[PDB]
C-alpha cells in the first residue's frame, strides 16, 4: 500500500523525526500541530488568516458538524472543505466522542426523550465520507484514563473490532486516509495488545488515544514511548489532545508526528498570549504601557503590527478583534515551534534545540518538570 | 484643508478636499463618508481583514467615547493615536461621542463634559478635553460641545439657546489652549453647531462659529428615528446655507442611505459609517442597488430560507465574502454564535457601503444622483 508519509531526517540521539505527509490537499511537513478549524472560525479568523500562517492541515469537528448543519448539508456544499473554503488538508474525528456504548455502536440520547440516534462504525465511516477530508479516524470505544477496571479492556478488543468493522465500509482508501486509535489506557499490556493487533491492519496511519485526560505525567509520556516503540516507522504517528509547549517537543523526542489540541485557541479567549517564556497575560495592567510586540521574533500580522499596550486596551473593551488577534498570534506560536522542531531536527541538532527550549521556558534546569526530565533522558537527551 | 469644489448641481457639493495630514498628500472626496471605529478599531476587523476591503476611506473616525479612558496610555506613548493602533496611514478624526453607544445625557455643564467608555464615566473640562487631544493628536478633532439641547424631549429655548453659547464658550476656550500647544497647532479644529430645534438659536449658532477660524463644521442635533425628520431636514438647509463653501461639512448621527442623499442635498460633505455595522450586528447584509431594527436595504441571515442557498450575499459584489462564501455558510455561523459572522458580514457590509459613496459622486458627476435617489427610496 503506498506511503502517505517519507521521513526526511531523524535524530540520531532521539526518536525525533523530520518528514512530509502525501496528502490529497497538498503536502504537510511533519512533526505538525493541526488547530481546530471549527474553533479557529468560532474565533473570527478566515481561511485566507489561516492560509497565511502556513497551516496546510486543520481538524474538523464530526459531532458538532452532525449537529449544525449536518452531514448532508456539507455533502450538498462539495464537502466539508467548499463548505468553509478551506483549501488545504481536513482531519476529521469519528464522532463518538450523555452517550452510552454497546457492540452496535456509540447510543445518543434525545433531550426530554426521544429516539434515539446510533453512531455505528458503518455509520462513523458514511458520515466522514461526505465531509470529505483527506484524514478519517476510527470508531474506537474511549474511557478515560482516570477509571480503571474491567471497561479498560472491554474497550480495547471493542476498538479493534470497530476497526475491522471501519476498514470494511471504507470502500475509497484512494480519496480518504482511515486512522486506528491506539486505545488499552494506561495498562502497559492492554495497550500492548492493542498495538499488536491494530497494527495488523492496513491502514496509512495510527493515532495514540486514550492520553492526556489528567492521568499523572509520568503515566502519560510512559504509555506514548510504549505507543511509538511498537508503532510502524515509516507510518505517521498521531498524539491526541496535546498542545502543551513542552508536551510537543518531549514527544516529539519521543517519535510522535502529529498533535492537535483546542489549547492555543481557547487562551486567546482568556487573554493569554503564547511565548517561548510560557505566556503573557495581556489583560492584567502591567502590560497597559507595555509598547512592545508580543513577540518580535514571531511572523504572525499581530505581532508584526500591534503592542501589547494596544491588546490590552482592546481586552479591556468591546471589540471582539482582541480575540482575533491573541487566536492568530497563538496558532502561529504552535506552527512557528513545530517548524523549529523540525528544523533542528533536518540540521541533526534536535537535543542541542530542546536544551535551549527547556531552558528558556523554566530557567534552571533543576526547575524543569521532573516529568520531562525523565521522559527526554530515556532518548538520551540530558539537560 | 484646502477644499476644491467640482461642482454644485441641486445643492449637492462634488469635489475634494487637499492638504491634509501630516504630510500634507492626502485628499478627501466629497461626498464621502468616514471609517467607523470603536477603541481605535473597526468592529470585527483587524489591520489584516481591514485590507481584504476595498474602497476603505482615507479618513477613519474615532470617539473619544471609547479612547478617553485610555488618556494616560496615549499620553505615554506620545506617538499618537494612528500609530498606537497600529494604523499610521490613515487620517483621524476625533468626534465626541460615539454613534451608536452614546452613553446617558444629562452630564452637560458649562464647565464640563462627560463621555462613556467601557471603563465607565469620564469627565472632562476643556483643559482636560485638549490635553486628551494632545495626546491622540487627531487630524482633525470636534471641538467640545452641548448637543443634548436637541433630544425626543420637549426641550425649552433657553436650553437651545444655553447650547449655543455654552458650545460657543468651549470653542473660544480650545482655541485658546489650541494656540499655547506645539502639538495641537498641528490637529484641525472642527466647530460644531447647536441650537436644538429653534430656528432663531440654530442660525446664530452657524453664524457665530463661522466667525472663528475652524477648519471645517460639524451639524449636531440632526439625528431622527426612524430617520431626520421633515423639521431637522429644513432646519440643516438654513444651517449650511449660512456656512462657507470653502470649509468640510461634517454631520454626526445620520448613516442610513436614504437620509445621506437628503443630506447631501442640503450642503453636507462627510457622513458617518456606522450604519453598515448596525446592520452586521443583527446579522443581516446589505442587498439594496445603486448601479444606475431591520430595514428593506438588508436581509437577514439567519432566516431558515438561507440554509442552502448558496449563493453569495449579493450577485456580483467584489467583496471577500461573496467571492469565497456562501448565504448558507454565512446562516450556519449565525446559528452557531459563531463570530466569523460578524467578520465576514462586515467586510461585505463596509463594502457594499463603500461602494454606494462611490455612485454618489459617479452619480453627481453625470448629474443623475436623482435616479440614485429614486432607485433607493423605491426599496422602502
Ligand atoms: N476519538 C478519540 N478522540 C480523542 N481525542 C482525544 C483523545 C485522547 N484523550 C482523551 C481520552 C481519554 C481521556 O479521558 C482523554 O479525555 C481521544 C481518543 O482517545 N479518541
Ligand atoms: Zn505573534
Ligand atoms: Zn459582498
Not at chain 1, 496546510?56 to 448539508?73: A, K
Not at chain 1, 452496535?104 to 462504525?121: A, I, K, Q, W
Not at chain 2, 446579522?283 to 440554509?307: H, P, R, V, W
Request: aromatic share 8%.
Amino acid at each position: 500500500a503506498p506511503r502517505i508519509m517519507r521521513l526526511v531526517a531523524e535524530c540520531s540521539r532521539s526518536g525525533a523525526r523530520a518528514g512530509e505527509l502525501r496528502l490529497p490537499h497538498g503536502t504537510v511537513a511533519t512533526p505538525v500541530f493541526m488547530p481546530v478549524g471549527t474553533q479557529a472560525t468560532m474565533k473570527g479568523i478566515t481561511t485566507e488568516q489561516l492560509d497565511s500562517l502556513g497551516c496546510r492541515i486543520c481538524l474538523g469537528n464530526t459531532y458538532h458538524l452532525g449537529l449544525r448543519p449536518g452531514p448532508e448539508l456539507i455533502r450538498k456544499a462539495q464537502g466539508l472543505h467548499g463548505f468553509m473554503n478551506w483549501p488545504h488538508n481536513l482531519l476529521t474525528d469519528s464522532g463518538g466522542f450523555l452517550s452510552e456504548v454497546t457492540e452496535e455502536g456509540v447510543h445518543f440520547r434525545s433531550p426530554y426523550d426521544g429516539e434515539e440516534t446510533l453512531l455505528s462504525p458503518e455509520r462513523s465511516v458514511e458520515i466522514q465520507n461526505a465531509l470529505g477530508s483527506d484524514i478519517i479516524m476510527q470508531l474506537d470505544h474511549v474511557v478515560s484514563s482516570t477509571v480503571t477496571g474491567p471497561l479498560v479492556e472491554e474497550a480495547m478488543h471493542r476498538s479493534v473490532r470497530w476497526l475491522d468493522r471501519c476498514i470494511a465500509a471504507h470502500k475509497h482508501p484512494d480519496k480518504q486516509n482511515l486512522f486506528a486509535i491506539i486505545q488499552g489506557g494506561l495498562n502497559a499490556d492492554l495497550r500492548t495488545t492493542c498495538l499488536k493487533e491494530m497494527t495488523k491492519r492496513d491502514v496509512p496511519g495510527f493515532a495514540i488515544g486514550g492520553l492526556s485526560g489528567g492521568e499523572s505525567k509520568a503515566q502519560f509520556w510512559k504509555m506514548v514511548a510504549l505507543s511509538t516503540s511498537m508503532l510502524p516507522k515509516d507510518k505517521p504517528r498521531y498524539l491526541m489532545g496535546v498542545g502543551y509547549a513542552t508536551d510537543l517537543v518531549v514527544c516529539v523526542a519521543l517519535g510522535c508526528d502529529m498533535f492537535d489540541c483546542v489549547y492555543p485557541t481557547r487562551t486567546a479567549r482568556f487573554g493569554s498570549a503564547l511565548v517561548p517564556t510560557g505566556n503573557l497575560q495581556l489583560k492584567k495592567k502591567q502590560y497597559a504601557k507595555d509598547f512592545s510586540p508580543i513577540n518580535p521574533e514571531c511572523p504572525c500580522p499581530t505581532c508584526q503590527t500591534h503592542s501589547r499596550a494596544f491588546l490590552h486596551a482592546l481586552l479591556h473593551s468591546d471589540n471582539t478583534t482582541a480575540l482575533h488577534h491573541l487566536t492568530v498570534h497563538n496558532i502561529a506560536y504552535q506552527l512557528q515551534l513545530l517548524s523549529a522542531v523540525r528544523s533542528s531536527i533536518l540540521e541533526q541538532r534536535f537535543p542541542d534545540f530542546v536544551r535551549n527550549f527547556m531552558r528558556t521556558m523554566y530557567g534552571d534546569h533543576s526547575l524543569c518538570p521532573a516529568w520531562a526530565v525523565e521522559a527526554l533522558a530515556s532518548v538520551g537527551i540530558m539537560l | 484643508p484646502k477644499l476644491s469644489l467640482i461642482k454644485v448641481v441641486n445643492g449637492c457639493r462634488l469635489g475634494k478636499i487637499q492638504n491634509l495630514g501630516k504630510a500634507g498628500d492626502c485628499t478627501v472626496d466629497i461626498p464621502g463618508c468616514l471609517l467607523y471605529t470603536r477603541t481605535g478599531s473597526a468592529p470585527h476587523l483587524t489591520h489584516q481583514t481591514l485590507r481584504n476591503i476595498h474602497g476603505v476611506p482615507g479618513i477613519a473616525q474615532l470617539t473619544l467615547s471609547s479612547l478617553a479612558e485610555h488618556h494616560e496610555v496615549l499620553a505615554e506613548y506620545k506617538k499618537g493615536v494612528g500609530s498606537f493602533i497600529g494604523m499610521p496611514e490613515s487620517l483621524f478624526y476625533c468626534s465626541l461621542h460615539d454613534p451608536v453607544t452614546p452613553g446617558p445625557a444629562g452630564y452637560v455643564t458649562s464647565k464640563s463634559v462627560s463621555v462613556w467608555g467601557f471603563g465607565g464615566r469620564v469627565e472632562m473640562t476643556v483643559s482636560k478635553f485638549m490635553a486628551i487631544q494632545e495626546a491622540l493628536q487627531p487630524d482633525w478633532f470636534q471641538c467640545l460641545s452641548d448637543g443634548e439641547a436637541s433630544c425626543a424631549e420637549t426641550t425649552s429655548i433657553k436650553r437651545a439657546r444655553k447650547s449655543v453659547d455654552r458650545s460657543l464658550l468651549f470653542l473660544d476656550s480650545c482655541l485658546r489652549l489650541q494656540e499655547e500647544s506645539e502639538v495641537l497647532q498641528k490637529s484641525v479644529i472642527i466647530g460644531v453647531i447647536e441650537g436644538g430645534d429653534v430656528m432663531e438659536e440654530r442660525l446664530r449658532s452657524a453664524r457665530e462659529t463661522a466667525k472663528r477660524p475652524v477648519g471645517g463644521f460639524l451639524l449636531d442635533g440632526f439625528q431622527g428615528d426612524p430617520a431626520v425628520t421633515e423639521t431637522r431636514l429644513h432646519l440643516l438647509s438654513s444651517v449650511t446655507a449660512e456656512l462657507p463653501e470653502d470649509k468640510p461639512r461634517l454631520i454626526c448621527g445620520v448613516s442610513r442611505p436614504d437620509e445621506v442623499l437628503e443630506c447631501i442635498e442640503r450642503g453636507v460633505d462627510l457622513f458617518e459609517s456606522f450604519f453598515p455595522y448596525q446592520v452586521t450586528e443583527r446579522g443581516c447584509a446589505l442587498t439594496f442597488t445603486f448601479d444606475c431594527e431591520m430595514t428593506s436595504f438588508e436581509i437577514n441571515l439567519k432566516e431558515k430560507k438561507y440554509q442552502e442557498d448558496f449563493d453569495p450575499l449579493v450577485r456580483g459584489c467584489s467583496c471577500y465574502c461573496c467571492k469565497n462564501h456562501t448565504r448558507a455558510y454565512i446562516h450556519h455561523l449565525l446559528m452557531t454564535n459563531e463570530l466569523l459572522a460578524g467578520v465576514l458580514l462586515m467586510m461585505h457590509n463596509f463594502e457594499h457601503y463603500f461602494g454606494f459613496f462611490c455612485s454618489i459622486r459617479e452619480a453627481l458627476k453625470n448629474d443623475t444622483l436623482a435616479q440614485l435617489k429614486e432607485l433607493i427610496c423605491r426599496q422602502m
